[PDB]
Each structure stands twice: as C-alpha cells, then as structure tokens.
Amino acid sequence: MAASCVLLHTGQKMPLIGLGTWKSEPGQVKAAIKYALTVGYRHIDCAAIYGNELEIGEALQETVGPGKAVPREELFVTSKLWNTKHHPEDVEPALRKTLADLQLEYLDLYLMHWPYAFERGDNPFPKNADGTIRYDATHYKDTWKALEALVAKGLVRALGLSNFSSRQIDDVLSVASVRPAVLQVECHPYLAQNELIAHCQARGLEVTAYSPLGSSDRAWRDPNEPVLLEEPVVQALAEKYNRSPAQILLRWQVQRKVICIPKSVTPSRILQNIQVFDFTFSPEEMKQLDALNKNLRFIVPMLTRVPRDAGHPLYPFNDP
Numbered sequence: 417m418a419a420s421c422v423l424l425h426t427g428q429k430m431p432l433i434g435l436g437t438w439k440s441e442p443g444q445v446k447a448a449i450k451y452a453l454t455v456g457y458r459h460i461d462c463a464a465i466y467g468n469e470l471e472i473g474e475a476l477q478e479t480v481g482p483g484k485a486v487p488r489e490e491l492f493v494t495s496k497l498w499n500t501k502h503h504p505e506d507v508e509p510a511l512r513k514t515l516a517d518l519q520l521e522y523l524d525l526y527l528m529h530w531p532y533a534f535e536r537g538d539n540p541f542p543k544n545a546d547g548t549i550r551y552d553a554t555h556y557k558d559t560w561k562a563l564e565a566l567v568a569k570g571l572v573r574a575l576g577l578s579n580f581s582s583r584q585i586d587d588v589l590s591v592a593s594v595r596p597a598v599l600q601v602e603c604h605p606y607l608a609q610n611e612l613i614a615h616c617q618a619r620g621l622e623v624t625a626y627s628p629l630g631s632s633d634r635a636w637r638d639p640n641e642p643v644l645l646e647e648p649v650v651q652a653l654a655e656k657y658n659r660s661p662a663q664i665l666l667r668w669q670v671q672r673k674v675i676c677i678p679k680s681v682t683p684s685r686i687l688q689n690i691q692v693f694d695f696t697f698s699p700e701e702m703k704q705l706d707a708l709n710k711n712l713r714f715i716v717p718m719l720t721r722v723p724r725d726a727g728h729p730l731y732p733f734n735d736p
C-alpha cells in the first residue's frame with residue numbers, strides 16, 4: 417500500500433498514515449473512503465460519535481473482503497468506545513453496534529475515546545438545563561476489563577487509549593491483562609507531546625497523532641490563535657521541498673515514527689497526505705520544527721470559552 421507501517425506489540429502492522437473521518441459527513445464519506453482505499457490507504461480511523469459509521473460500512477462492504485478490491489486482512493480499522501458506554505454491561509453492545517454499522521466481523525483496534533464517562537443512555541451528550549454534562553463515575557479501569565473481554569470474543573484484535581494522560585496510562589497498565597497497543601492524542605509541532613511519546617515508548621504503546629494538520633476544520637476557532645498550516649517555518653520547508661505545508665506537518669510526524677490520521681474528503685489532499693515517505697528532513701530541519709512547540713492544544717471539549725469537561729477530576733489534560 418501507499419504507506420510504511422509501524423509494528424504494534426501485538427504483531428500487527430499499523431500504517432503510519434490513516435484516513436481521519438471526524439466531520440466526514442454521510443453523503444460524502446463513502447466517496448472519501450473509496451478514493452483513499454483505491455490510492456493505497458490501508459488504515460481508517462472511525463468512531464461511533466462521528467455519526468458516519470453506517471455509511472463507512474457501505475463503502476467497506478463494496479470495496480473490502482472476498483471478491484472485492486481490497487482483502488480484509490490488508491485493512492486496519494480503528495473505532496472508539498463513546499463516553500456514554502463506559503459501564504461494563506454497555507461495552508459489548510456498543511462494539512457490536514459499531515461492527516454492524518461498519519459491516520465488519522472484527523476491529524483491528526478499539527480505543528476508549530475519553531477516560532471519563534457520561535450518563536448511560538441513548539443521548540451521546542446527556543446534559544442539564546444549563547447545558548452542563550450529566551457525568552457518570554464509572555472508572556476507566558472497570559471499562560478496560562470489559563474491553564478485554566471483547567478480545568477474548570474475537571471481536572477486536574487490539575485495544576488502546578485515546579486522550580489519556582501518562583498517569584492514567586500507568587493506571588490502566590496496573591490492571592491490564594491485555595496491554596494497550598496505541599495511544600491516540602492531539603499532536604503536531606505546536607503540541608509536540610515529547611514527554612508523553614517517550615512515556616508510551618517506554619511502555620510499548622505506539623502513538624497516533626490526531627488533528628496533525630491543526631484541525632482547521634474545527635467550529636470554535638479563536639481568531640487570535642495561530643494557524644498551523646500558515647506557520648512561516650512550515651511554509652519555508654514546503655517551498656524548499658516542493659511539497660504542501662500539510663505534507664511538511666505529516667512528514668515531521670512519520671519521521672518521528674508517530675502515526676498520523678489526517679482527515680480529508682478532497683481527493684487531491686487525500687493523495688498528498690499519504691505521499692510523505694519519499695523525502696526526509698535534515699537534523700537541522702527537524703530541530704526547526706521541534707522549536708515550534710508551544711503547549712497549544714486545539715482540541716478541547718467546549719460549551720456555550722468555555723471548557724466543558726476541564727473541571728472534571730478524571731479530565732486528562734490537567735496534568736503537565
């Protein structure tokens with residue numbers, strides 16, 4: 417396929433570039449999936465909360481499997497367990513719904529989307545009349561053991577974590593019979609995650625960078641905050657290498673051996689996003705991109721300012 421891979425501790429090879437699907441709407445996502453698969457993507461990043469798994473499933477049924485264009489075994493599919501589904505009794509039903517929507521037998525990777533839980537039910541964002549969330553106190557260690565039962569059932573090959581801090585990861589590892597294979601977190605030159613990455617490396621977790629292009633797609637942008645794709649150093653390197661700024665951002669990550677899942681529905685961008693394995697940055701150029709680190713996080717749960725979940729005791733970002 418188009419991308420090089422990293423070996424997870426499970427023995428699975430995970431492509432260093434995957435297709436992100438948040439905000440890829442029903443009515444466009446089937447085309448994005450089909451285009452990406454045809455040009456050599458072998459890694460898709462999904463989530464129940466994105467509201468598009470049913471359509472992704474139609475794309476997969478037509479394109480992936482026996483007698484189809486892509487063998488199932490060559491495809492890496494990630495999905496994620498949503499916050500309202502942390503209770504042990506809800507974990508299997510949640511995965512089974514995802515598998516039915518995606519029209520798959522099994523997932524290659526299943527992540528706990530966030531370390532904290534929302535009230536059980538069929539409202540993905542259960543809330544009060546003030547707009548604040550109704551939380552649930554199910555601990556992630558309890559959810560983890562429920563997730564482990566899914567591996568024993570042959571429904572998921574590997575488990576992982578999304579938006580966990582180093583302390584929370586260590587906490588999961590203290591009870592894990594099945595070790596998490598992957599940590600998925602926001603990561604790009606403004607939020608380099610150097611220490612967290614080193615932490616994962618020590619414990620055998622590979623890291624996937626979400627929002628690796630700075631999620632210019634996002635609906636709550638501070639006009640005052642810098643745009644990653646517009647960073648002068650990035651644009652300078654883009655000119656030098658005859659590449660797009662997005663390719664610079666992506667190259668930086670895959671050169672660090674960090675998995676990236678850029679989202680696009682634009683065929684030309686989908687193609688360029690995976691073409692990041694034919695050039696290399698010098699040690700000085702890597703240092704220049706490394707210097708951009710500024711502890712600037714773009715992806716934070718917000719309400720009607722203001723951080724929505726930032727006051728929760730199990731909020732992952734409050735640690736350094």
Ligand SMILES: NC(=O)c1ccc[n+]([C@@H]2O[C@H](COP(=O)([O-])OP(=O)(O)OC[C@H]3O[C@@H](n4cnc5c(N)ncnc54)[C@H](OP(=O)(O)O)[C@@H]3O)[C@@H](O)[C@H]2O)c1
Pocket residue numbers: 435436437438439461462529578579600601625626627628629630631632633645660662663677678679680681682685686688689715
């Ligand atoms: N685990 C989590 O809590 C979590 C959180 C956030 C994201 N994610 C995952 O990570 C994925 C990526 O993050 P993201 O979607 O927030 O943002 P992103 O991939 O950093 O950026 C997406 C935006 O960049 C544009 N784009 C894509 N390729 C481009 C290119 N080559 N040149 C210029 N613009 C380009 C896209 O526009 P077009 O589509 O119109 O081309 C879209 O507006 C998500 O889709 C999701 O799968 C996970």
Ligand SMILES: NC(=O)[C@@H]1C[C@]2(NC(=O)NC2=O)c2cc(F)ccc2O1
Pocket residue numbers: 438463465466467529715716717718
């Ligand atoms: N702002 C945030 O931190 C998160 C991000 C997030 N996108 C994502 O891929 N995982 C997320 O949880 C998201 C996705 C949704 F479908 C709705 C809201 C939402 O908010």
